[PDB]
Amino acid sequence: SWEIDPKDLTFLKELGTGQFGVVKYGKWRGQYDVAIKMIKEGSMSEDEFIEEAKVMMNLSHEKLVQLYGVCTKQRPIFIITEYMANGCLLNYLREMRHRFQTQQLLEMCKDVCEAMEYLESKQFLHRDLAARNCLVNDQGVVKVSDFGLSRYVLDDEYTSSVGSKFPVRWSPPEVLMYSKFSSKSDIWAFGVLMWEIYSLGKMPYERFTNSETAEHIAQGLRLYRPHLASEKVYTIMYSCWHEKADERPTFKILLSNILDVMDEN
Template sequence: MILSSYNTIQSIFCCCCCCSVQKRQVRTQISLGQDGGLSEKHTQRHRPRGSELSSRKQSNRGCVQPSKRKPLPPLPPSEGAEEKIRVKALYDFLPKEPCNLELKRSEEYLILEKYNPHWWKARDRMGNEGLIPSNYVTENKITNLEIYEWYHRNITRNQAERLLRQESKEGAFIVRDSRHLGSYTISVFIRARRSTEATIKHYQIKRNDSGRWYVAERHLFQSVPELIWYHQHNAAGLLTRLRYPVGLMGSCLPATAGFSYEKWEIDPSELAFIKEIGSGQFGVVHLGEWRAHVQVAIKAINEGSMSEEDFIEEAKVMMKLSHSKLVQLYGVCTQRKPLYIVTEFMENGCLLHYLRERKGKLRKEMLLSVCQDVCEGMEFLERNCYIHRDLAARNCLVSSTCIVKISDFGMTRYVLDDEYISSSGAKFPIKWSPPEVFHFNKYSSKSDVWSFGVLMWEVFTEGKMPFENKSNLEVVEAISKGFRLYRPHLAPMCIYEVMYSCWHEKPKGRPPFAELLQTLTEIAETW
């Protein structure tokens, strides 16, 4: 039997300038042994802590109500807590302004802030900070295919073949997006054998139900980079192993959205005029240089030909339309007359002249690739709710690598020449216009689709004039009665069907550009 009693012992402690009294409980246990004697133990009872204290209070006081105090709200995340994105430079970038940061191809950078979709603030390994063009970098993750030299996202089958033929090495290869969403294609160069010419094989990279990638079903991989690495060392079902990755990284620098962040006004003293390269609806076009190192095209706008104030406001929006298949607007010069429009320079000039100069020399695969480039750019404009209004071969330009880009989108809105906007005027693009435009002046992405069908016709006729023997008035009458352009002899029926679908009388009956692009891609993969 154990008898317990509690005694209180007071002990006094001094702390700094004040004294406190701490009470210490000592428990006296009196044990009654079997022999009837008494023994006494003293144990120090420590001050209970945490949950021990809570449970003891409940046992001493009976049933105690739980605390009704609400838990404290979580602390807000600190500014530095957000995970920074690490990127890899795809191209070299030389600073154009003091606020820019130099990029070196293949090096890693830390993104500090995304000012807008086109310009980001970054830091290099040395701690230097500045603005960089977002289309010059990609997220540095092993699963991100863009960090690999062999991957080409925006490339057609024909462009892939042309690239590999230029390399002309056994096993030279690239990986590109397939026409099937979420899958890829390996294009590989096979050297000439005794009985066969050099050829290019296309192998589809597929994914099985368990999410593993393969070319040959016996060899499965968790990721596309693992698959490519394996086939670089083992043919394993391919005609040759993948020996030489062919890349565009660093060789063809993309245009930036303006020369720097929100720099749309360009000082004319920074422009040098080299030579006249053409003339357009608004005035003379020159090849020039900005700050003596960036090649540009400079359009001098004739006074009275354009509503300049409206255009200057629109230019701020147009600069933000940045895409690999659009001619980039760098800025405008408004400080003196005439007004200058400064754009990306395209070495091979106007698409219409390009087609006519190479008549009989362009394979149908190349002609289809031209249409794919234009369709890709128009799909971007459609997605961003931007209407071109004057899509035609004359308003597309060709780069040094034979990539076609759309130019002068939206410019017709600022023309002051009444003859141009009149359905009876010779300058009005009647032959590229649908009924709702020449009857009611009603523009939309679907009116651009009609014009795209006519552009395809221009491409597959190698630059012929549509309705060449008809006046504008006769064209209006013929189109209104259901007459359409004939099938060019270079265009297979599947291509003509795409053109014809663009010429539906009702805008709603015409396919969107996204659908057209998918159709053209599927055709290209089967040729």
């Protein structure tokens, strides 16, 4: 794992707080934009993360928010990542909702699907894919962020499937019932993400509680077709929500489906 010298980091701006505490914007060696997570003590299974972190860093793709390296020879430890000037996709969708062409929406889906196909090819699970966990750069490219980190979270409200922070609305039945994560639970989440994109950042199952969502999707309830989604596009997101995991497509197939819709237009 790349151990970055904290002396090479210059903090510039507060970016707010996430599950592991404060995140800042800064530069590495006076030139490269980076984000720096300052890992709050007690928020992360740190020994576990450090022991397992090299695989995460070796993940390299244009549509992933890259994990560059770590600073572990001090307290608190740092995680250093690629910086994305336009912030998280969920806010981006909401703030420009009157400006998007539908072709731009499909392109966001393509971006995320490319990232997820790559992770799938590495047998690497995201485990918390959602618009809130995608970021947007200065040229409008969407990238997937914080893949794999859900595993190291110490927060019972997040790790319990009946916790108030658990991503119930992005979870398939087998995750809610058995905590069975697989590439196919990332597939389900991706479908919900597509719905978030085409709904311009609406909350899935708004007005339903988490437990009501779990209850009803287990009984077959599915998100409705957003007004901006064509039938071809809705067919793609809907295919991600087969009750049976083994009936859901791969990200390779989804990518091929999305490319086909793009060509046709």
